[PDB]
A paper describes a structure:
Here we present the cryo-EM structure of an early ancestor in the evolution of complex I, the elemental sulfur (S0)-reducing reductase [name]. MBH and [name] are found in the anaerobic hyperthermophilic archaeon [name], which oxidizes the redox protein ferredoxin, produces H2S or H2, and conserves energy by pumping Na+. [name] reductively cleaves linear polysulfide chains (Sn2−, where n ≥ 4), produced abiotically from the reaction of H2S and S0 (Eq. 1) in the hydrothermal vent environments that [name] inhabits, into two shorter polysulfides (Eq. 2). [name] contains two proton pumps compared to one in MBH and likely conserves twice the energy.
We determined the cryo-EM structure of [name] in a dimer complex form. The atomic model contained 26 protein subunits and 116 transmembrane helices (TMHs). The [name] monomer consists of a peripheral cytoplasmic arm (MbsJ, K, L, and N), anchored to the membrane by MbsM, and coordinates three [4Fe-4S] clusters that transfer electrons from ferredoxin to the substrate polysulfide. The [name] dimer complex is assembled via extensive contacts at two main places between the proximal membrane module of one [name] and the membrane-anchored peripheral module of the other. The second contact involves the tryptophan-rich C-terminal extension (W90, W91, and W94) of MbsD of one [name] projecting into a largely hydrophobic cleft in the peripheral domain of the other. In [name], a large hydrophobic chamber, similar in size to those in MBH and complex I, is formed by cytoplasmic MbsL, MbsJ, and their membrane anchor MbsM. The proximal (p-)[4Fe-4S] cluster in [name] and complex I is at the top of the hydrophobic chamber but, in stark contrast to that in complex I (and MBH), the [name] p-[4Fe-4S] is coordinated by only three rather than the expected four cysteines (C28, C93 and C123 of MbsJ). In [name], this structural motif is three residues shorter than it is in MBH, leaving one of the cysteines (MbsJ C25) no longer able to participate in cluster coordination. The unique Fe atom of its p-[4Fe-4S]2+ cluster binds polysulfide (Sn2−), accepts an electron from the medial (m-)[4Fe-4S]1+ cluster and catalyzes the two-electron reduction of an internal disulfide, generating two smaller polysulfides (Sn-x2- and Sx2-) and the superoxidized form of p-[4Fe-4S]3+.
Author numbering:
A (entry chain d): 3 to 84, 88 to 94
B (entry chain x): 104 to 188, 201 to 206
C (entry chain a): 7 to 167
D (entry chain g): 2 to 111
E (entry chain h): 2 to 488
F (entry chain b): 4 to 82
G (entry chain N): 6 to 52
H (entry chain e): 4 to 235
The structure:
């Protein structure tokens, strides 16, 4: 079709946006960020501007998502939300 | 103590207002900085009160420069004669 | 020193394939950039120097890339047949296969070709054998060959050097 | 409304929502990067003329038939603006766990 | 003449030549910064005496494409003055930071400083709204990297809230640019103001509100400020000057530029009636949060926000008798806040830290650097015949004809409060000492004092300098002589 | 030229089930990695749809930048 | 013997200083929702 | 539940405000008031038949300059935020050998192709930035599949500043006449110019500036991931 | 030509049955194997199909050249993706299905 795949891509970007912030696992949040860069690149290409599509491909796919998990390497991986005696204090 | 006397000759020889409040502020500062040598709590109380007086005068001159339009003190008595024949109980 | 122009030749022919309308008034620019990309890093393609220009060898590989692709299409249609609606359940495999290949790009090529056959996913190549995430286990737990799990790609990768 | 307008403003919406309510710091940076992504998506989706389309050919396609040559230059900087700002903020996200002991906004007390 | 286009290119080429000489040695790294900002004062003074020679600004073109299709650098009567004062302040910083910041890797600090100078001469020369955004993001990431450059936990977090707030504001600013372009289709402010009268009354409101919003976040008023009395408290001492002198003025000018570029549309009056209210809300909160303040660097950090809020008070009130006097505060408060963070910086580098307990006792112990803090703290309330007295009188008289007596009795209330936390500070450094340690510091005993004699000459002669801002108000007051001096 | 497009849209929202549900930490990763290749095969398909020779120039660039991402996501999991 | 103050303990009353007891309008409230978040008593609780 | 629901209310009124503010035009044609000049005068005024590479380096000529200023400032900012004089790898935890040899042979396959992107801003879309970012990707593949791979820093950021200087020296020797004036196709300064208008004799001035900016942004992100993969 | 119009149909039914095979798998490992199988050979089928779509149609032939470039590039890059996805998935727990034998990799870890 014409507009139906557009609605599919845009609702897929929204469901990968909402589920990019609902998770606690930060590696999963980098996964959601990479999928958002995916659907943004596809929407850039489908809106007929290939310059921004290939630039956002080379930036958001493995220089914004692969720099973020690159930062959670020597940091946390969970939310660490905690059972317990002296807890939630 | 000599800056204060030049404030004192300034307020008395003030026939405009932009020489008036300048000289008044210089006088307030010079008197404060004279009594700002010991017992700071006594000094700063005088400074806060007299700055509140100086700057409430700046508020009043802001209102009487707004409502009339002109700033000059000799002619501003003439236009008060002009409306001599609800915002002025604040002034 | 001859492997440098070997890397130049491979980068040049990839540049030739990448640009459909190759013009002689354009090709000097790609030849220049293939040259600077070669002299940047030509310490990478060291598969025993330049000596891969054998007319038997490249004809062997191009004659057996449809051999590869026929294995891929047949094995992938087989794993498409594996999706039966209540039935044909796949159990995993862990079964191993040993190699005798030097020229470590051959270990790459065996791992890639076995990853492109029915589901035989490589995991953790060591220096003696391979470890394969196989399909439904009926052949063997340890395999003393390769023809029971895969097709003999080991004989044609034996002559990649 | 068209899907591009709603989807670009909802990506900015979700990126804004991930700054207010979330508590882990790297989740806040995820919200910043998402919101910048939706911003440059809106920045492209302003000039689509619904029709004639070849921004870069000008050889096989006739001229005066390309789409929006102004925002494609506004977005070529404004994307890598986002990755440079994110690469800058990630260094602070590393230093805050190195010097302090945690990465939660209610526990970082100077 | 486009020969004076080196206000951006010369800091650029020198900031790209300083990582070229970072491996050639260690000696000529920090002395490479002083000679270039001296060359910056030279190329600024060229533009300064060429702008005030005639009545025409230099329309620095971006090539062989006349505006609006290209970028124009309208270096107006405003711009040459501010490029001059940022050149002389950065040259005062370069001869300061030579022996005051060597604790940390100054191997790469020089390019970060000079790129802030690039964002400086870019931000107060921009003509395109795109170039406005790009130079503001240069200054923003400069500040992200340079308020974090101490790596001490309390300074690491001091950047963090600013990087996430400047990220959200730049995001909103690009949305506002996309909406103003979405109605008009043009970008250059010359072709924008002649068009933005009948584009759409319901589209220009949200775009202008979000543009003023997203340009305000990198500056300070009420919500988006509290990173700034966290940035001055935790930064290298020379860049606390260059932030408190410069970066507040570029944001407040470019906000008050583009606000006076759309002065015909509906809903604009409510926008400036919000901007009045938020500026009054920031002269009270900032200059009253310094009252029970312990750290003396924070005690000046709160004071620098309260002085820029009253700049915002008269930069968006009317058209005249106070916009041309609002600039009279921006070129004046930069000098007196250069004096403040010099003295705090020299205390923090000589004695150690900025706590009052190690700030107490500087009458006999320290030389006339303490007199420089004295004559600086005198000039923020503006008591004697000084320059902030002249300027604050011009701003309070500016808030007469429109927005009166409530947006006066809060800014003028704060100077009563600011009268308190200075003479609780000058008293505990001159008349509480009990400690005669000579500790000679005669390397700034002349240079800060020739600066301290620069506020004593403008204090007695404002009319050789107040005639400048009459012809330098002509870049913000109107649109018609601005546009006709472009097209 | 037209029917394949709606089939690929059916394919990608049918792959959405693995990233929404799925209790493990890596089933989401196998969800995104397959989602890139089907959209690369989408991006080649639109070159037929808009008849443009330049629209393949983004497809191979996205065929790189999936692979770097999924190595980087699956390298901290091992080290 | 070792009397601590002379007037050091006695403090000054204050108008609007109780607003610093209003700080916990936004922190997490310290309670345990007993249906059903359990407590796990001590390893040697007397029972 | 108070904070999330109240944020959803305020963000719904924000989105409704923007959507009511998005009532300019339903994706119509009437947008270019100055934008038609960018399209109808791009084949003869610059030389690049590409639309976006002529508007952002020649027309909006001080905006890829602020862009490389932003990327260079990101490099020097991350390098100033992380500085310890030790700079060791993490534990390096090898893991696979079809990965190291996998990214070994694949490293010049991206090095050939990333250069192809930034040399071609004439008929191909893009510019210097996707090619430079995938050159950084190739650097990352060799950096995330080996046990050290420390490219020598003394001699690495020299060429980054040299490439930025190579941009600005085209502005400074461009100042031999006027503001920019391209120095390359309209006057026979060092070589010829304006041969035809295809992908032959490299159009006008736009390719060599993309080689230089692609070299700058190519060594940009590789340095960032380098000094961010360094422990004590 | 028309043979391309059937080959891309074969590749897109291969795509759809691939994606159906992703959700019709019990555990992680068979989910990973069948997804990296059937979504990367029908890929090359589609790409060479679009090339021979442009054999006589299209403009001349040059789409086939870029098609064979991206196909031959996509053919060798997804095996390394599947390996590095699988190999990291064995660490940090992540157990397998009820297989016949799984221990031969575990025992050759703990051989010491």
């Amino acid at each position: 079709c014409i507009v139906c795949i557009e609605y599919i891509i845009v609702a897929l970007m929204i469901i990968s946006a909402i589920l990019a912030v609902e998770w606690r696992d930060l590696l999963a949040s980098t996964v959601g960020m990479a999928a958002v860069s995916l659907f943004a690149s596809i929407l850039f290409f489908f809106l007929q501007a290939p310059d921004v599509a290939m630039t956002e491909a080379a930036i958001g796919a493995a220089l914004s998502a692969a720099v973020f998990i690159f930062a959670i390497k020597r940091t946390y991986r969970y939310e660490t939300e905690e059972l317990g005696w002296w807890v939630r204090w | 103590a000599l800056m204060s006397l030049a404030g004192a000759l300034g307020v008395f020889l003030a026939n405009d207002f932009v020489v008036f409040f300048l000289s008044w502020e210089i006088m307030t500062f010079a008197s404060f900085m004279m009594v700002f040598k010991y017992n700071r709590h006594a000094s700063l109380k005088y400074f806060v009160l007299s700055i509140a007086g100086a700057y409430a005068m700046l508020l009043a001159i802001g209102i009487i420069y707004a409502k009339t339009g002109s700033l000059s003190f000799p002619e501003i008595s003439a236009i008060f004669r002009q409306d001599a024949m609800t915002e002025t109980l604040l002034i | 020193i001859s492997r440098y122009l070997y890397t130049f030749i491979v980068l040049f022919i990839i540049w030739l394939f990448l640009t459909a309308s190759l013009d002689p008034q354009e090709l000097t620019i790609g030849a220049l950039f293939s040259a600077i990309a070669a002299l940047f890093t030509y310490e990478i393609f060291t598969t025993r120097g330049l000596a891969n220009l054998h007319p038997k060898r490249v004809l062997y590989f191009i004659a057996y890339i449809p051999y590869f692709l026929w294995a891929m299409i047949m094995a992938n249609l087989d794993v498409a047949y594996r999706v039966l609606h209540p039935k044909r359940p796949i159990n995993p495999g862990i079964v191993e296969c040993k190699t005798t290949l030097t020229n470590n790009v051959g270990k790459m090529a065996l791992a890639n070709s076995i990853t492109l056959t029915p589901g035989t996913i490589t995991l953790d190549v060591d220096g003696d054998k391979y470890f394969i995430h196989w399909i439904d286990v009926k052949d063997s737990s340890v395999e003393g060959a390769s023809e029971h799990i895969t097709k003999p790609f080991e004989k044609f990768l034996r002559v990649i050097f | 409304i068209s899907s591009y307008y709603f989807g670009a403003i909802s990506l900015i919406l979700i990126g804004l929502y991930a700054v207010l309510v979330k508590k882990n710091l790297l989740k806040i940076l995820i919200g910043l990067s998402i919101m910048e992504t939706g911003v440059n998506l809106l920045l492209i989706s302003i000039g689509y003329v619904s029709g004639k389309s070849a921004p870069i050919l000008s050889e096989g396609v006739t001229a005066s038939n390309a789409v929006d040559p102004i925002p494609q230059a506004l977005v070529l900087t404004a994307i890598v603006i986002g990755v440079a700002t994110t690469a800058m903020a990630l260094s602070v996200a590393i230093l805050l766990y190195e010097k302090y002991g945690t990465l939660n906004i209610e526990e970082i007390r100077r | 003449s486009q020969v004076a286009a080196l206000l951006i290119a010369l800091p650029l080429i020198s900031a790209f030549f300083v990582p070229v000489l970072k491996q050639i040695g260690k000696s000529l790294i920090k002395p490479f910064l002083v000679i270039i900002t001296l060359l910056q004062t030279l190329i600024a003074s060229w533009a300064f005496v060429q702008v005030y020679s005639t009545g025409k600004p230099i329309i620095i073109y971006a090539g062989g494409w006349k505006p609006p299709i290209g970028i124009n650098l309208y270096i107006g009567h405003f711009a040459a003055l501010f490029i001059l004062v940022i050149a002389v302040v950065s040259f005062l910083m370069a001869l300061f930071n030579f022996k005051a910041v060597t604790v940390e890797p100054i191997d790469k600090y020089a390019m970060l400083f000079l790129l802030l100078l690039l964002g400086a001469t870019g931000m107060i020369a921009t003509g395109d709204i795109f170039n406005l955004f790009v130079f503001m993001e240069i200054t923003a990431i400069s500040a992200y990297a340079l308020t974090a450059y101490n790596k001490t936990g309390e300074a690491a977090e001091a950047s963090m809230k600013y990087i996430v707030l400047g990220g959200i504001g730049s995001s909103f600013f690009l949305v506002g640019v996309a909406l103003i372009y979405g109605a008009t289709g043009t970008l250059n402010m010359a072709h924008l103001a002649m068009l933005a009268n009948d584009i759409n009354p319901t589209v220009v409101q949200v775009g202008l509100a979000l543009i003023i919003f997203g340009l305000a976040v990198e500056a300070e008023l009420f919500p988006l400020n509290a990173w700034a009395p966290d940035a001055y408290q935790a930064a290298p001492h020379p860049i606390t000057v260059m932030f408190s002198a410069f970066v507040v003025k570029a944001g407040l000018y470019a906000m008050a530029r583009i606000l006076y570029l759309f002065k015909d549309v509906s809903g604009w009056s409510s926008l400036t009636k919000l901007l009045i209210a938020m500026a009054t809300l920031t002269v009270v909160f900032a200059e009253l949060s310094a009252l029970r303040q312990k750290n003396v660097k924070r005690m000046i950090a709160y004071s620098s926000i309260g002085q820029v809020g009253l700049i915002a008070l008269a930069l968006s009130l009317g058209t005249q008798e106070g916009v041309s006097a609002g600039v009279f505060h921006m070129l004046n408060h930069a000098i007196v806040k250069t004096m403040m963070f010099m003295a705090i910086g020299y205390v923090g580098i000589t004695l150690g830290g900025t706590m009052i307990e190690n700030f107490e006792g500087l009458g006999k112990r320290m030389p006339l650097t303490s007199l420089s803090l004295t004559i600086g703290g005198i000039a923020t309330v503006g008591v004697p015949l000084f320059n902030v007295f002249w300027s604050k009188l011009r701003i309070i008289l500016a808030a007469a004809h429109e927005g009166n007596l409530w947006p006066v009795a809060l800014v003028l209330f704060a100077s009563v409060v600011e009268a308190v936390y200075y003479f609780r500070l000058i008293h505990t450094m001159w008349f509480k000492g009990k400690s005669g340690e000579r500790i000679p510091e005669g390397a700034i005993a002349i240079v800060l004092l020739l600066l301290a004699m620069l506020i004593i000459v403008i204090g007695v002669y404002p009319t050789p300098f107040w005639n400048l801002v009459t012809k330098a108000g002509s870049d913000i007051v109107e649109v018609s002589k601005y546009v006709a001096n472009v097209l | 030229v037209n029917i394949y497009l709606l089939l690929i849209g059916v394919a990608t929202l049918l792959s959405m089930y693995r990233v929404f549900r799925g209790p493990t930490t890596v089933d989401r990763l196998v969800a995104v990695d397959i989602m890139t290749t089907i959209t690369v095969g989408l991006m080649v398909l639109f070159a037929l749809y808009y008849r443009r020779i330049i629209f393949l120039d983004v497809a191979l660039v996205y065929a790189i930048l999936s692979f770097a991402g999924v190595i980087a996501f699956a390298r901290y999991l091992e080290g | 013997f070792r009397i601590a103050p002379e007037e050091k303990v006695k403090k000054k009353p204050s108008f609007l200083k109780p607003w610093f007891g209003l700080k916990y309008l936004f922190k997490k409230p310290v309670t345990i929702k007993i249906p059903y978040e359990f407590i796990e008593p001590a390893p040697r609780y007397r029972g | 539940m108070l904070k999330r629901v109240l944020a959803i209310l305020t963000i719904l009124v924000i989105g409704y405000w923007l959507a009511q503010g998005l009532a300019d035009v339903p994706f119509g044609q009437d947008k270019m008031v100055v934008g038609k000049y960018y399209l109808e005068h791009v084949k003869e005024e610059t030389g690049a038949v590409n639309a976006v590479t002529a508007v952002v380096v020649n027309y909006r000529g001080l905006d890829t300059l602020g862009e490389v200023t932003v990327l260079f400032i990101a490099s020097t900012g991350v390098a100033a935020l992380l500085w310890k004089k030790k700079r060791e790898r993490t534990a390096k935890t090898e893991g696979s050998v079809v990965l190291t040899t996998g990214a070994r042979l694949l490293f010049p396959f991206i090095a050939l192709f990333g250069m192809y992107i930034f040399i071609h801003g004439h008929l191909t879309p893009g510019g210097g930035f996707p090619g430079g970012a995938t050159i950084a990707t190739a650097f990352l593949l060799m950096y995330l599949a080996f046990t050290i791979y420390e490219i020598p820093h003394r001699g690495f950021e020299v060429t980054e500043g040299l490439a930025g200087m190579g941009y600005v020296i085209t502005g400074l020797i461009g100042l031999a006449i006027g503001g920019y004036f391209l120095f390359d196709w309209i006057w026979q300064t060092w070589g010829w110019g304006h041969e035809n208008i295809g992908r032959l004799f490299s159009g006008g001035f736009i390719p060599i500036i993309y080689t230089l900016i692609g070299i700058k942004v190519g060594t940009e992100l590789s340095g960032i991931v380098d000094n961010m993969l360094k422990e004590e | 030509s028309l043979i391309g119009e059937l080959l891309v149909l074969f590749g897109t039914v291969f795509y759809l049955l691939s994606t159906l095979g992703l959700i019709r798998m019990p555990d992680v490992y068979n989910r990973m194997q069948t997804a990296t199988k059937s979504a990367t050979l029908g890929s090359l089928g589609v790409i060479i199909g679009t090339g021979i779509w442009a054999l006589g149609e299209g403009f001349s032939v040059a789409w086939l050249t870029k098609a064979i470039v991206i196909a031959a590039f996509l053919l060798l890059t997804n095996p390394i993706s599947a390996h590095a996805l699988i190999r990291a998935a064995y660490k940090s727990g992540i157990p397998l299905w009820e297989g016949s034998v799984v221990d031969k990799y575990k025992e050759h870890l703990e051989r010491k």
